[PDB]
């Protein structure tokens, strides 16, 4: 895999600040997969792994705190919030409860809250990319890259050293 | 203010000052969605131009317009693109709701309706609204956006 590849990804705007891409590549050709605990907190574990120094398996509490303030500022205006269908307060009461799963909705709000770019890369089988979903305007080299696999798991990705 | 004469209806008044605000008003008094409204200056009969100010079409304080309601229920084909970037074709009517389109997408894609949301030209489609409100055309491409949980 060439450096020319990661550099030339084509992102298509879905709405302001959200993009999609369908590149064809294998995750492990450009990324190191950093596996997460596998409790109901893997979404928040993945974010913490890539944003907090000296990350441990309780770091994710800071990420969820961030998501709460994010929700207060942004939840009502988020497009997935209608899929959820709960009031801000009902939403918060659920989201903050132990082992409640994270999702693209939290990734959207968190991107705004921490001024970062998050990419969720989806694979249907093996590590063959089906889609990349990007929240925020940064590129892949500056993004918080997550891997969503097996329909229900989130892991963190780091770009391999030779591609930076 | 300006008087609006329904054709088979009667009459009513509204206050403004674009053609797009005139339709929002009409819609806010008789519920007829903008996309089904046709307008013309009375009694000149001259169509109302969508992209020009009312003052430049002979409309001012206390003018009259004729509202004609167009069906717009003629079926058409549009594309809905899935997460893999693969589109499928759907027949629809501009009078169908977004939620109805979501039912079709759901059956074809195998994804329950609470796990995706649709967009057209950067606008999220709202379940309760008619497709016509978004200006969909034959072979327009809608995006199917997945909600991912884990």
């Amino acid at each position: 895999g060439p450096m020319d590849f990661l550099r030339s990804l084509d992102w298509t705007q879905v709405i302001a600040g959200q993009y999609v891409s369908n590149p064809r590549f294998n995750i492990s050709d450009y990324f190191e997969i950093v596996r997460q605990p596998g409790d109901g907190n893997c979404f928040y574990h993945s974010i913490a792994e890539l944003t907090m120094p000296n990350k441990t398996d309780h770091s994710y509490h800071y990420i969820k705190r961030l998501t709460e303030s994010a929700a207060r500022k942004y939840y009502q205006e988020e497009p997935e919030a209608r899929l959820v269908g709960l009031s801000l307060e009902d939403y918060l009461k659920r989201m903050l409860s132990d082992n409640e799963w994270g999702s693209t909705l939290e990734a959207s709000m968190l991107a705004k809250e921490m001024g970062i770019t998050i990419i969720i890369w989806t694979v249907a089988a093996s590590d063959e990319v089906e889609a990349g979903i990007k929240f925020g305007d940064g590129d892949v080299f500056t993004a918080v890259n997550l891997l969503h696999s097996g329909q229900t798991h989130f892991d963190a990705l780091r770009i391999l050293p030779q591609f930076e | 203010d300006l008087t609006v004469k329904m054709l088979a209806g009667n009459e009513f008044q509204v206050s403004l000052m674009s053609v797009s605000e005139l339709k929002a008003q009409i819609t806010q008094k008789i519920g007829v969605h903008a996309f089904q409204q046709r307008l013309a200056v009375h009694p000149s009969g001259v169509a109302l131009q969508d992209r020009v100010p009312l003052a430049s079409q002979g409309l001012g304080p206390g003018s009259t317009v004729l509202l004609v309601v167009d069906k717009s229920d003629e079926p058409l084909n549009i594309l809905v693109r899935n997460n893999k970037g693969r589109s499928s074709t759907y027949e629809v009517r501009l009078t169908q709701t977004v939620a109805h389109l979501k039912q079709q997408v759901s059956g074809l894609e195998g994804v329950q309706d609470d796990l995706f949301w649709l967009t057209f030209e950067g606008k999220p489609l709202e379940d309760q609204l008619p497709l016509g409100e978004y200006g969909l055309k034959p072979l327009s491409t809608v995006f199917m956006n997945l909600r991912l949980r884990g």
Side-chain angles (χ1 to χ4, degrees), chain A residues 1-3 5-150 152-164, chain B residues 1-4 7-12 14-16 18-20 22-27 30-70 72 74-83 85-150:
Chain A
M3 176 61 167
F5 177 81
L6 278 187
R7 221 154 181 81
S8 63
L9 291 168
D10 182 24
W11 296 98
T12 311
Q13 175 166 315
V14 172
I15 52 171
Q18 178 164 165
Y19 311 84
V20 71
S21 178
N22 297 109
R24 287 311 175 234
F25 70 99
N26 299 326
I27 294 296
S28 310
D29 292 342
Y30 302 88
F31 293 97
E32 161 197 0
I33 306 175
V34 186
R35 313 283 184 199
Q36 298 307 312
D39 51 17
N41 301 116
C42 62
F43 174 78
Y44 306 100
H45 287 306
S46 303
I47 309 299
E49 174 75 59
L50 298 174
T51 61
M52 300 172 60
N54 311 319
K55 181 267 186 171
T56 78
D57 292 350
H58 305 99
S59 298
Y60 77 93
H61 281 305
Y62 292 96
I63 298 318
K64 294 186 69 164
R65 284 180 190 103
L66 288 184
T67 308
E68 167 192 16
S69 64
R72 294 184 191 285
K73 314 179 188 176
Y74 304 114
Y75 179 78
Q76 270 136 353
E77 312 79 55
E78 296 285 334
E80 304 196 35
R82 309 186 204 97
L83 300 187
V84 169
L86 299 170
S87 56
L88 169 60
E89 291 294 323
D90 286 341
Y91 167 79
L92 285 172
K93 168 170 167 181
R94 177 160 306 168
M95 178 275 295
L96 288 168
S97 75
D98 307 349
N99 296 113
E100 188 75 30
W101 295 9
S103 71
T104 38
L105 169 51
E106 290 72 35
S108 176
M109 296 179 307
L110 265 182
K112 294 181 196 63
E113 177 69 6
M114 308 165 65
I116 62 184
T117 305
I118 300 165
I119 298 157
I120 296 162
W121 295 98
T122 58
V123 305
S126 180
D127 63 327
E128 186 166 274
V129 165
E130 159 180 307
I133 300 166
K134 179 146 85 71
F135 304 92
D137 309 312
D139 67 10
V140 70
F141 306 101
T142 66
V144 168
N145 295 275
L146 308 190
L147 173 72
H148 183 266
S149 58
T152 56
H153 196 50
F154 280 108
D155 292 315
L157 305 166
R158 298 191 193 276
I159 304 190
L160 296 166
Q162 62 255 41
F163 305 105
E164 64 186 24
Chain B
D1 77 321
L2 203 137
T3 296
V4 177
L7 197 160
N10 204 5
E11 266 172 277
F12 46 98
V14 166
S15 63
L16 305 196
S18 53
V19 179
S20 182
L22 171 56
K23 291 181 178 188
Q25 285 295 113
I26 291 180
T27 308
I30 62 176
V32 175
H33 289 280
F35 84 93
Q36 291 164 317
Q37 306 182 43
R38 304 301 183 271
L39 299 178
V41 180
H42 194 80
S44 82
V46 76
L48 275 208
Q49 296 304 342
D50 174 32
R51 291 163 196 84
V52 353
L54 296 176
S56 295
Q57 307 192 230
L59 251 59
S63 291
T64 302
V65 289
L66 183 47
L67 170 71
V68 169
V69 173
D70 170 33
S72 282
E74 183 180 6
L76 66 154
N77 292 333
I78 64 176
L79 306 183
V80 183
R81 207 173 95 160
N82 72 20
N83 190 64
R86 179 65 71 98
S87 304
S88 301
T89 287
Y90 303 79
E91 182 206 274
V92 300
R93 309 181 183 261
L94 294 187
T95 51
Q96 291 161 353
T97 51
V98 170
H100 180 270
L101 173 52
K102 289 193 66 185
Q103 292 171 214
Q104 297 184 69
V105 179
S106 176
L108 180 150
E109 291 300 339
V111 181
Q112 49 185 233
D113 54 19
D114 65 327
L115 290 184
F116 67 92
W117 56 291
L118 306 174
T119 48
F120 181 59
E121 301 184 334
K123 288 167 297 172
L125 309 190
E126 291 182 55
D127 296 349
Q128 76 285 359
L129 293 182
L131 298 184
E133 203 85 287
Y134 296 101
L136 294 163
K137 297 184 187 85
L139 301 188
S140 283
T141 298
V142 171
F143 280 15
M144 182 195 184
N145 303 294
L146 291 196
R147 169 160 169 74
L148 304 181
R149 310 181 66 242

